[PDB]
Amino acid sequence: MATGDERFYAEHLMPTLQGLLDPESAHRLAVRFTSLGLLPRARFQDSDMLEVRVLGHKFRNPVGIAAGFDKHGEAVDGLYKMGFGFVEIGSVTPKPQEGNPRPRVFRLPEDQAVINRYGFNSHGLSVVEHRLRARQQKQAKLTEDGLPLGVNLGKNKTSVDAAEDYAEGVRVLGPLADYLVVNVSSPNTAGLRSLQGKAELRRLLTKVLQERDGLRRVHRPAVLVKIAPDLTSQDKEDIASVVKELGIDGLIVTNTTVSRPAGLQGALRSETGGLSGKPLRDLSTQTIREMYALTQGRVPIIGVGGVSSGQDALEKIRAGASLVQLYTALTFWGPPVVGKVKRELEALLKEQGFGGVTDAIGADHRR
Numbered sequence: 001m002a003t004g005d006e007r008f009y010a011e012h013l014m015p016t017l018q019g020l021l022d023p024e025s026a027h028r029l030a031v032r033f034t035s036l037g038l039l040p041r042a043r044f045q046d047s048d049m050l051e052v053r054v055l056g057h058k059f060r061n062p063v064g065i066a067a068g069f070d071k072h073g074e075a076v077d078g079l080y081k082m083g084f085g086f087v088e089i090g091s092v093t094p095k096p097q098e099g100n101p102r103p104r105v106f107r108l109p110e111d112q113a114v115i116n117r118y119g120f121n122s123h124g125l126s127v128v129e130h131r132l133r134a135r136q137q138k139q140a141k142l143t144e145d146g147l148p149l150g151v152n153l154g155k156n157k158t159s160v161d162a163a164e165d166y167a168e169g170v171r172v173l174g175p176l177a178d179y180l181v182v183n184v185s186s187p188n189t190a191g192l193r194s195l196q197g198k199a200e201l202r203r204l205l206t207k208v209l210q211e212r213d214g215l216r217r218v219h220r221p222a223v224l225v226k227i228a229p230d231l232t233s234q235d236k237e238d239i240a241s242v243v244k245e246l247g248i249d250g251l252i253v254t255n256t257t258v259s260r261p262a263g264l265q266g267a268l269r270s271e272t273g274g275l276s277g278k279p280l281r282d283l284s285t286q287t288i289r290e291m292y293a294l295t296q297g298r299v300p301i302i303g304v305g306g307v308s309s310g311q312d313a314l315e316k317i318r319a320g321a322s323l324v325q326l327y328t329a330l331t332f333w334g335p336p337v338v339g340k341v342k343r344e345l346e347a348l349l350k351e352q353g354f355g356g357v358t359d360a361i362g363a364d365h366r367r
């Protein structure tokens with residue numbers, strides 16, 4: 001019906017449909033089509049070389065969908081069908097909220113970048129809870145079969161106590177997640193990034209971990225903190241210190257950037273919001289490299305930001321990522337980008353003498 005070529009989607013289908021629809025409508029349609037399974041079932045069969053064991057789980061391949069694509073947990077099964085080794089939904093806030101006024105998402109095709117200022121539009125914990133409960137046992141089997149689920153938590157715009165927002169997310173969605181993400185790095189909620197500060201972070205994560213440890217064993221997720229690419233060296237040292245002090249299970253590195261790298265060409269480069277895609281790529285990779293060294297390679301990292309190829313994935317893995325995610329590449333290349341990243345990553349691992357993804361994790365640090 002629509003299956004299923006790399007060049008066709010990249011050269012013809014995606015540029016045409018982008019020319020027809022504003023970015024938010026395009027996203028909604030993508031979510032709808034994905035959730036109905038109106039995609040080719042990915043033809044790439046994952047080799048054993050791509051398997052990774054981390055965070056108390058087996059991951060059939062190390063390529064996941066980043067938070068923000070499926071904010072409300074509507075397309076999880078369709079995303080596994082697309083070939084992702086793991087799915088992260090969210091960010092989800094405790095109460096439903098509409099997010100920022102439109103327009104709030106912008107394409108920069110000359111930069112293969114996106115700028116967004118959604119501001120945590122979210123159906124809320126209760127809606128997402130029911131959505132996930134309706135397939136909880138199916139997810140238990142997928143997880144067992146190497147396809148884990150992450151749930152990314154945010155906070156409401158008008159909440160007084162941020163820590164109580166994240167605590168409520170742990171209590172409600174923690175029992176449905178293989179891992180939870182404390183998202184303290186959205187650039188689109190006022191004051192949120194200040195929660196990355198040493199004292200605020202320590203207090204917030206102590207409470208998050210207390211809540212998590214009170215869940216029954218079979219419903220007890222790993223806890224990860226998702227961080228910005230715009231941190232000072234001091235901020236990064238402080239995060240690494242808190243992570244090790246508290247026994248945080250992992251880091252997601254990185255969210256979108258509020259910087260605007262010299263050289264951006266897109267007409268919309270000066271829109272407010274987080275920048276994603278290719279201009280973020282090496283900034284994200286360098287942040288992974290730093291965080292890996294500061295945590296002595298002992299804290300699993302999910303690397304994210306501008307991944308659109310096997311080389312992009314492998315650079316992050318060698319810099320210290322155990323797993324990678326992508327989002328923005330999907331908006332330019334479409335669904336075929338997933339098999340593309342996996343096939344190229346496998347070829348490059350073979351070319352560089354690695355036995356598998358596991359041998360490559362942090363390899364640059366051992367040179």
Ligand SMILES: Cc1cc2nc3c(=O)[nH]c(=O)nc-3n(C[C@H](O)[C@H](O)[C@H](O)COP(=O)(O)O)c2cc1C
Nearest residue numbers: 066067068090091116255276277305306326327328
């Ligand atoms: C439109 C859009 C919405 C996003 N929403 C979220 C979100 O709700 N929570 C989150 O932690 N990250 C969010 N992100 C960030 C992505 O998860 C990822 O960290 C970032 O876009 C870098 O990856 P990419 O270059 O592959 O897109 C969003 C990104 C985009 C482009």
Ligand SMILES: CC(=C/CC/C(C)=C\Cc1c(O)c(Cl)c(C)c(C=O)c1O)/C=C/C(=O)C(C)(C)O
Nearest residue numbers: 017018021023026027030033107330331334335
């Ligand atoms: C039939 C079809 C049309 C895709 C919608 C278009 C024209 C662009 C996709 C697109 C975008 O153009 C933009 Cl800007 C965003 C933010 C998103 C986010 O999901 C996005 O998916 C299928 C799309 C997909 O399967 C994916 C690749 C998931 O978007």
Ligand SMILES: O=C(O)c1cc(=O)[nH]c(=O)[nH]1
Nearest residue numbers: 118119120186188256274
């Ligand atoms: O909802 C959003 O605005 C959003 C959240 C986030 O974590 N990152 C992002 O780029 N946008």
